[model samples]
Target: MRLEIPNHTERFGVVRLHEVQRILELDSGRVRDESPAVGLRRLDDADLRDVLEQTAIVVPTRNERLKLLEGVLSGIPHEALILVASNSSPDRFQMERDLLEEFAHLTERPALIFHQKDPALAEALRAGGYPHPIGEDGLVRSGKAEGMILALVFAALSGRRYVGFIDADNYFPGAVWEYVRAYAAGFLMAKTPFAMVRILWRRRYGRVSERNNRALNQLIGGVSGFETDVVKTANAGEHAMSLGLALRLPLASGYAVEPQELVSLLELYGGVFPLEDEEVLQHGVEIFQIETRNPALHENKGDEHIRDMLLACLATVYHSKLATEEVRQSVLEELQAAEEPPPPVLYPPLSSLDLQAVRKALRGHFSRFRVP
Candidate 1:
């Protein structure tokens, strides 16, 4: 588990516009690197297990196959808490829940499953002024981002130190193992509490997006004055961050959650808008994009899905607080050239949510499934 020191790293006082451009020129193809050994320090399995024991790995699912979901669950280390946030149909949800409950028993760890559309949960969020995930029908919207927000709140409630996410539809459990290990390796190397680790896939099925990376570098640099071109894993679905960082950042409503996280990180932690607490501001944040040797194989959702993700990611940048008018225009021009609509953005940290109340609501939901 001993990770090699990062081949490249940078610290910025602020994400300045000019410094960003310079970084882009300098970082070029160095945004992603080899796995654990490629980082500055290496941690042993014991070290990874220690951190993971305090972490929660959230799996968000829709209508994914049960076998695939099981594969994902099997790959997760038993030390980490498992939170499955589902937005599936009634039958599918029941099946998934049953499987999770059985898996929990098998692993001797609690696996909490909650439906995104749970009426009680949605009502609780509304009562707390966290209404972004609620839809027109008065139900939680069915999106990965919504599930992520729920998962973060759940992790916070469970008192987990870090949170990681794995797609439920992954066909390869081995890849899942690599991702979680990479997360631990990244955390082991982190000197600060506010940090995030994103995995870059090795194969065609898992390659990081250079296009989205460039687009975000342009926007975050142009708007926030942050100088770094190395935040290249924009749509990184398999990633992890500290719960402290998670609660402070805004969660996007859709697929853009991944990229939006990057934007939010730069905006809040990149120094342009530092926390009022000087001690907190000084701690700063570190983002690590590591490449996994394992080739990730997953179900191809489709082209339209891919297009929507692209549009959503760009929109996040365009509407980001760090985005300048010029950067916004650039996003618009790109979207227009592709003939896409303006991407809707959502914000305001989960700190706005009443954690106690949400925890109570979840307890109520879980109690319903108990066999008394």
Candidate 2:
């Protein structure tokens, strides 16, 4: 089917109950925050309501805080299918099971709670005869990427033509719903045959209070600590890709998996690589990152843990380089034939103030809702 833009000019009778309120039933009296954050802008609630009713949403999460999930779920379209790919604890006291059930009940369409970490996926991988015992690169390769790859595999296998992702760690509930529609809107506007799409995530740095005084060093580092701006949107865990792109592209195993995928896609389809080596690779499934707001929250895991996480991400990126024949040979030779995995990368530490502020921001906004 050809994609076309919505007829925004015309009024289509009355909107539904779920359409009007948009998850939270807001009254004129309720306080509203409209200041734009990093990756997104505010849209009129009425227009946003129209956009949402036209698309589907699927969510994947692991060890995610429950309140955050609940808030996110509330904002999505009632009719959209919400696939909660969870790897929550198996214990009876675990909130994963409870949250799954709650989300299933809340969703208007058929919702599923799949065990992303379940033996079923590993079993499926084994049955597929994938490179068994896929070595772990800490939580990098094993947890998030594992869940993500499995989710896409499941989506492709299930015959979904379009797919998107939202990290389980978001603080802004309403922004996610908007992210979902903004992406869908892009697809709806595409004039080509099928194409690939990656939503450009804009993360709003530290809160408004911190921007006033330069004194908030801790604030700058904690909440607004972006890796860099040159890459525009780096380290995106939220995105959507056409079914063909999802199924055909290579998958990475860890923390760097995200950027690795982006670079590869840009290389293949964006036609930046030489045809001599990469000609066999398919290129040009039109890929675009839908620029939007990311009201992200970071639960600071201390300096040691944070450093380890970033290094792991970098290592993943390095591994992607090694995936190429030229880079692989060079990397293997540098290790001097020792079987030792790549050494942990060392990066300068974040300032204590930044760390402290980040920890506090996460605690405060982890489950709260925010304006785009």
Candidate 3:
């Protein structure tokens, strides 16, 4: 189906495969509930038009981020089915609720909106280990992961072929369009069903105090220095992987989740798939890494928080890359021989995480961290 956002309109339009059809309304409220697992409400009406059914975009959001998401919606293909896997409190503001309802109405087809509760996600976290339900200032963050997993499970059950992710904290609405398009393009071009795409962005360590800048540079350099001596990037929040890839990947609970996903997919397809062509053909998956560098919002995380995230990402990378004795020794030797530099205040410190803590943090949470 043709999905287009005209240059003149304030609204994004979803047209069926035949551009002649337009989706003006769908009952999103049918799926909106205060509970965790509401029955799958396919509000499809025969009277309404059908669009191309190649992909579904799964956006995991918290705090009723309508404005941020509206901008993102503007950039996505209008024909793409939108499953908003929302994580919000039972007492979410009336205005936010109204906005979501309105957002659903804007779609021409059934736009499934899932309002997930915190307790169910907490249960999922506890089930995965890390029984302690950690919270901050009366709010929980792990629901983001739960919401995503919910989307994955929903896609599997609903017979949807593909799933994509768009974070709600995005300030640069324009970037979301590119992310979704790039992912769709990559998936369409893939040679196998097991083919998963990892869309990496050129990340930036946002502006900070001079002290913090020094620390940030040193911290990042220390970890990445031996790889290629290049410094034009960091990991961005925009990425999309296949549904099949999700089934095989062991997810990370903390902010390191993205890196963990990358490594797992690489191991599965890069190594295992080559050894067993028959099994690989049966699995029907491929790994694709696409790069996009459009600027996203530059809000800064505390130096300490950034430090923690960097360490988590690097730790996952180190373990994955150093799976053998020879590789591990080479990594240690390269680090030991690298030149030392002054540190910035926000730069991560040179201390190793306790393996137990790392394990716990990696599995204890779902979709951790505040998006902004």
Candidate 4:
């Protein structure tokens, strides 16, 4: 609940990227008994609880073990509404529902659970004017981004002020609580309504992370006219955002999803592309990178998976509108990719969609879909 006050925050037009904030105290308690140390900000538990009250944590699951799902559900703050967006088989998904029902009865926390492969949800998306998540089978595609976006759309509709993502494959339930708490703390420290808080956990895995982060430093330098290594957490799985910013951001499918967040932010708000949101332009966007005290424990599937994730992360940077000629060449040579690792399959922002209509179409279905 206590973290460093950003001594340096790099500003690119409307976006203010804060340097990584280190956690000083994991639990600062509900009241501030003593003054926080110099160069630190103490976000008391009570304040963070208020933020959680307005947040909807979206868990994107793709056939993860039922126990893993249960662990994830158990750790989320009871104050926040939990939305489980699943890409599991019907039987597995039903078991998840059963688990959620049991969880709901015990915890008595508000939650919304739904399978991505539902016909009724398809009707809602298509009728609502955003159908990018649908596939040939007429179900929401099984990508992590697809499921998160699906959850996010409904999260926005549910009138929550904030939304965050927590992957379902985490081994430690305690770490999950830390991520959500870090998210709320970052939101507390934000300067704008349009904001994002990305976590920097201990001992992050993936060669993709290092490469993409290096490329991101280059990308930020190219735009800001300086060299600095401030941008980290390029592929952060546990991050949160204000709905004001999220609804206006585009998403890329597959593994590119996480890194694509940076590319889209630069293009949209960095003044690389034409300015669109006048209010955001005036108030600015704040992105906080907060480091956790706990190390993450998740599966690291070997080589092939790593290659795909690396290539996907690189593709977002390589194909970005903000990418200079030099940065593009850097990505190509690094990946030894032949001819532009395919441009990201970008989904348009949801700000223009008829959300009210989508909610209307989904109302009966979503209500009946609830387990507890």
lDDT of 2 by residue, 43-119 (tens): 44444444334333557665667787877777665634555666666662157557656565555344445565444
Ranking by lDDT: 4, 1, 3, 2
For 101-208, candidate 1 gives per-residue lDDT tens digits of 888887777777888888987887876678877889998777788888877877887789999999987988877887787787667767778778887764332322
Q: Of models 1 and 3, which has the larger lDDT?
A: 1
Estimate candidate 3's RMSD in Å.
Answer: 14.7
Q: What's the lDDT of the predicted structure labeled candidate 2?
A: 0.44
Taking all chains together, the TM-score of candidate 2 against the true structure is: 0.57
**Whole-model lDDT values for every prediction:** 0.73, 0.44, 0.46, 0.84
Model 3 residue 249 CA deviation (Å) reads 1.6
Please report how far candidate 2 places residue 349 from its true position, in Å: 35
Candidate 3 structure quality by residue, lDDT tens digits, 275-302: 3445454555544444455655533345
lDDT of 4 by residue, 32-89 (tens): 4877678789888889999999999999887789888899888888888989898888
TM-score, structure 4 vs. true: 0.95
Q: Per-residue lDDT for 106 in model 4?
A: 90
Q: Give candidate 1's total backbone clashes.
A: 16
Top-scoring candidate (lDDT): 4
lDDT of predicted model 4: 0.84
